[PDB]
Amino acid sequence: RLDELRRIVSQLDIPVRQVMIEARIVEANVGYDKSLGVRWGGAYHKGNW
Amino acid sequence: SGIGIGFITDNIILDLQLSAMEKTGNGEIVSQPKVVTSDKETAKILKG
């Protein structure tokens, strides 16, 4: 029993495997916004948009 | 914005204005999230 348990002991006393996990986050945001306000105002003949 | 003005004052004061606004807005949103999940397990993707 001693010997059998010793063999199991040898198998069990094994280093647990560490792993370095590297996760990369890539975010790309592209925003294009154009606004046009066109004004035609004349108070001379009262025409104003 | 939209206005049409007509004015007389000497004979009579008559001001006639037509005010019109026409607005068109189209918005398209396309969002697609991808999640990798194990079989018969719950996984979530959340952005907000």
Task: Write the DSSP string, B4-42.
Answer: EEEEE-SS--EEEEE--------------------TT--
| Residue given tokens 């996984």 in the structure block | B43
Rounded CA-CA distance B21/B15 in Å is 20
Contact list in B for residue A47 (CB cut-off 8 A) is: 3, 5
Asked if A17 has any chain B CB less than 8 Å from its own CB, the reply is no
Q: Are strands A47-48 and B14-18 parallel, antiparallel or unpaired?
A: unpaired
- State the DSSP code for A17: -
What dihedral angle (degrees, nearest 10) is formed by the CA atoms of A5, A7, A13, A17? -130
Short-list B46, B26, B25, CA closest to B35 = B46
Rounded CA-CA distance B14/B20 in Å is 20
Q: B6: phi > 0 → left, psi -120 to 50 → alpha, else beta; which?
A: beta
Q: Cβ contact (<8 Å) for A49 and B7?
A: no
Asked if B46 has any chain A CB less than 8 Å from its own CB, the reply is no
Neighbouring CB atoms inside 10 A of A46's CB total 14
Cβ distance A27 to A18 under 8 Å? Answer: no
